[PDB]
Amino acid sequence: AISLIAALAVDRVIGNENALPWNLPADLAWFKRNTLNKPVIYGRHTWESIGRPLPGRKNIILSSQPGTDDRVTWVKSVDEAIAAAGDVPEIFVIGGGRVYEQFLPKAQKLYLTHIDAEVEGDTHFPDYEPDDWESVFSEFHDADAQNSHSYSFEILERR
Ligand SMILES: Nc1nc(=O)c2nc(CNc3ccc(C(=O)N[C@@H](CCC(=O)O)C(=O)O)cc3)cnc2[nH]1
Ligand SMILES: [Cl-]
């Protein structure tokens, strides 16, 4: 089954021109624990942002442009990306915006981090109908010595 994971600032903005103005190691830990040892799908731009494959995970990159690396799997379509992932219980889509958009219709779960930050950004997470989804988990955290902003984790399951 397909799962989407993302960190959202106020107004569902997932990023912009510049680096994100928050320090949230707690979110990174949450991200690792949920995606560890599972196939992860992402686009050309996210690849460029990280530069190297994510450890212990099966990296699948959706790109219309030919692949430039042998350590990760390169696909040209959504159907091909899902096939390259295999017959595993859970497959994660980790971005970016246009990729989340193509995968939302087929997602069964949403792992969201709601960050209390007013970030003026260009890219937004797709709008999802609240009625089509059930919030089976939500946990609120305040900012602390390690995390700069207050935030909440949420797991939604498709109805
Ligand atoms: N919750 C959530 N937080 C994110 O930061 C996030 N980032 C993406 C896409 N961008 C990125 C950028 C960097 C790494 C990365 O280098 N992660 C390392 C953790 C490093 C670490 O703390 O060891 C990883 O191994 O997962 C992953 C995704 C998608 N969904 C997200 N979702
Ligand atoms: Cl991307």
From Swiss-Prot:
Gene: folA
EC code(s) of this entry: 1.5.1.3
Pfam families assigned to the protein according to its UniProt record, in alphabetical order: DHFR_1
Lineage, top ranks: Bacteria, Pseudomonadati, Pseudomonadota, Gammaproteobacteria, Enterobacterales
Gene Ontology molecular function: dihydrofolate reductase activity; NADP binding
Recorded catalytic activity of this chain's protein: (6S)-5,6,7,8-tetrahydrofolate + NADP(+) = 7,8-dihydrofolate + NADPH + H(+)
Keywords: NADP, One-carbon metabolism, Oxidoreductase
Function: Key enzyme in folate metabolism. Catalyzes an essential reaction for de novo glycine and purine synthesis, and for DNA precursor synthesis.
CDD domains: DHFR
Residues annotated as binding NADP(+): 7, 13-19, 45-46, 63-64, 76, 95-102
Pathway: Cofactor biosynthesis; tetrahydrofolate biosynthesis; 5,6,7,8-tetrahydrofolate from 7,8-dihydrofolate: step 1/1
Protein name: Dihydrofolate reductase
Superkingdom field: Bacteria
GO biological process: dihydrofolate metabolic process; folic acid metabolic process; one-carbon metabolic process; tetrahydrofolate biosynthetic process
Residues engaged in binding substrate: 5, 27, 52, 57, 113
